[PDB]
Amino acid sequence: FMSSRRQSVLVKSNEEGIQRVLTSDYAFLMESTTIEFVTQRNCNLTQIGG
Amino acid sequence: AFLTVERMESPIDSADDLAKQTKIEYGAVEDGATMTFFKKSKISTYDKMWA
Numbered sequence: 828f829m830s831s832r833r834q835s836v837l838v839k840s841n842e843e844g845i846q847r848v849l850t851s852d853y854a855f856l857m858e859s860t861t862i863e864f865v866t867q868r869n870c871n872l873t874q875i876g877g
Numbered sequence: 878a879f880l881t882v883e884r885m886e887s888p889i890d891s892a893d894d895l896a897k898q899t900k901i902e903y904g905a906v907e908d909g910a911t912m913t914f915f916k917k918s919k920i921s922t923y924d925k926m927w928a
């Protein structure tokens with residue numbers, strides 16, 4: 828998917844990636860420690876999956 | 878019982894919902910630009926449509 832959808836779903840920063848989840852149905856992939864920081868500071872986000 | 882299965886049907890809205898139901902038949906132009914795309918694609922949805 829990501830090879831076919833470059834400059835569409837491939838954001839270049841974490842702050843614009845969390846915002847893209849905050850706008851559309853976006854399922855951003857990143858490191859687990861920062862997700863444990865964002866989810867505890869934002870009650871509209873969650874960590875699904877292991 | 879009528880009003881809960883006349884909603885639980887989910888008619889076709891994307892290729893993802895149409896990738897599963899092999900009852901509704903797929904289709905393409907024979908060796909055009911559309912058939913060439915699904916033959917070379919590696920996406921999980923679009924390879925099952927070529928199957």
Ligand SMILES: *[C@@H]1O[C@H](CO)[C@@H](O[C@@H]2O[C@H](CO)[C@@H](O)[C@H](O)[C@H]2NC(C)=O)[C@H](O)[C@H]1NC(C)=O
Nearest residue numbers: 845846847848849850851852853854871872873
């Ligand atoms: C869950 O909540 C809202 C209400 O339907 C949806 O959010 C909208 O999604 C569309 C689709 O991209 C956006 O254009 C709108 O700007 C969104 N509005 C708001 C207020 O967020 C959302 O899509 C719903 N469904 C999910 C997450 O699957």
Ligand SMILES: *[C@@H]1O[C@H](CO)[C@@H](O)[C@H](O)[C@H]1NC(C)=O
Nearest residue numbers: 848849850868869870871872
């Ligand atoms: C999600 O929650 C945060 C803080 O709780 C809020 O600022 C934001 O507007 C909320 N977003 C939506 C789409 O409700």
